[PDB]
């Protein structure tokens, strides 16, 4: 019942509007909550405009009938989160919630990625298996590319890799896992880790004991 | 100030029932507010599942009525929740709430802090295996290999290194299976003197490890 968009990005120091819609606000009002990675909602807009001691004056709420709004002035980085708008059914039975409305602050500087590489673990082997790790953090945007190497060779098959994902620091991390036979580990002299990154490469070599 | 903490089973079978306690601090049950429950699947959004009144009366979300109990005990000050034949839907971190309700409108003025219940069908125990580590600093970690369902949780030496710890987030693999690391970047110079322990539990599976990473 209650209609908010997806996502919402603005710039460091601009102003964001999340709307909420919804034929219930004029009776039942909208209520605004925050919510972060790992912990619970908390609310910062209260019944349309009002705003709790406590949540920074950045913050404010204006109502427009089947619609009302939350509005964060000079927007940071810790504003980057999840936003809820809530209010109730036509019958007054129930609470409605909105969608929710993620926040992405964009204009982070960039930042090469940092890169470990390991090789399979004596464990690992004994088990007749094998795993290359491929670690890459710190980097920014979030987009990077990873290519593997058995010696000089392209490898493409046993590749595994996450899409990357923002750290509690606001940059970026993924990993990439390459399966071997132990044979195939044994066979060759080294294998890498190649990592670009806006057009540029760090490379990671480990080879057998 | 009042405060909510949820407690009970991380871990259901499927068709079971789910059962959370919220102990109510610093204030008492009687009292002008309801009590509710909202759940949140990873990466959803937030869902009601009912409220309570200090007297016993109860609401609940249609979608859910028939599978719901919600109750207060006044004597241990706490209000519970129980779930009836959960199935994976029904995965998903639990809030206990306090509700600010008038004449006409309502909203959440206090949370709990969640609490994860799993609906366990299929599992798969990771196997554990050492990432070991000159000057400057040294990386070392621990793979925690091919698991389902999620979570895992990572800690080193129980706890008590968190600096320099990064678990990274798990790759699903076209196996269907999780893998994660948990990486420590620790001086060089404390290698051959310090000992890292990385502590691994999967308790859907019951694996529970704590893995030495030696040189
Ligand atoms: C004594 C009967 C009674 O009071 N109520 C009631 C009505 C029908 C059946 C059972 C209980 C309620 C009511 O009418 O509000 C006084 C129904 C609505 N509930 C609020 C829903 C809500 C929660 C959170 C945010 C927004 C909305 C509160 C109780």
């Known amino acids: 019942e209650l209609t908010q968009p997806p996502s919402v990005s603005v710039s460091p120091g601009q102003t964001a509007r999340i709307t909420c819609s919804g034929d219930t606000l004029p009776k039942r009002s909208g209520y605004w909550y925050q919510q972060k990675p790992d912990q619970a909602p908390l609310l910062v807009i209260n019944?349309?405009?009002e705003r709790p001691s406590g949540i920074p004056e950045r913050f404010s709420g204006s109502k427009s009938g089947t619609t009302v709004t939350l509005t964060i002035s000079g927007v940071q980085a810790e504003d980057e989160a999840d936003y809820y708008c809530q209010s109730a059914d036509s019958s007054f039975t129930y609470p409605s919630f909105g969608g929710g409305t993620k926040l992405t602050v964009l204009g982070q500087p960039k930042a090469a990625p940092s890169v470990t590489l390991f090789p399979p673990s004596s464990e690992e082997l004994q088990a007749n298996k094998a795993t290359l790790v491929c670690l890459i953090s710190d980097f920014y945007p979030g987009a990077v590319t990873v290519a593997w190497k058995a010696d000089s060779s392209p490898v493409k098959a046993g590749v595994e890799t996450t899409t990357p994902s923002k750290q509690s620091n606001n940059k970026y991390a993924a990993s990439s896992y390459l399966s071997l036979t132990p044979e195939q580990w044994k066979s060759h002299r080294s294998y890498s880790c190649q990592v670009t990154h806006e057009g540029s490469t760090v490379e990671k070599t480990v080879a057998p004991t | 100030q009042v405060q909510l903490q949820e407690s009970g089973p991380g871990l259901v079978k499927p068709s079971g029932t789910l059962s959370l306690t919220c102990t109510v601090s610093?204030?008492?049950?009687?009292?002008?507010?309801?009590w509710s429950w909202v759940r949140q699947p990873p990466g959803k959004g937030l869902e009601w599942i009912g409220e309570?009144?200090?007297?016993?009366?109860?609401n609940y979300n249609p979608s859910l009525k028939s599978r719901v109990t919600i109750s207060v005990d006044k004597s241990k000050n706490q209000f519970s929740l129980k779930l009836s034949s959960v199935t994976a839907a029904d995965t998903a971190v639990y809030y206990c709430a306090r509700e600010v309700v008038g004449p006409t409108t309502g909203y959440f003025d206090l949370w709990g802090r969640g609490t994860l219940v799993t609906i366990v069908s299929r599992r798969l125990p990771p196997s554990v295996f050492p990432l070991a580590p000159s000057g400057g600093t040294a990386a070392l970690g621990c793979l925690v290999k091919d698991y389902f369902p999620e979570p895992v949780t990572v800690s080193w030496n129980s706890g008590a290194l968190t600096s320099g710890v990064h678990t990274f987030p798990a790759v699903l693999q076209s196996s269907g299976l999780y893998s994660l690391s948990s990486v420590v970047t620790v001086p060089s110079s404390s290698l051959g003197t310090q000992t890292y322990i990385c502590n691994v539990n999967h308790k859907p599976s019951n694996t529970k490890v704590d893995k030495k990473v030696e040189p």
């Open positions: 309570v009144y200090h007297t016993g009366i109860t």
């Open positions: 019944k349309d405009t």
């Open positions: 610093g204030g008492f049950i009687s009292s002008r507010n309801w």
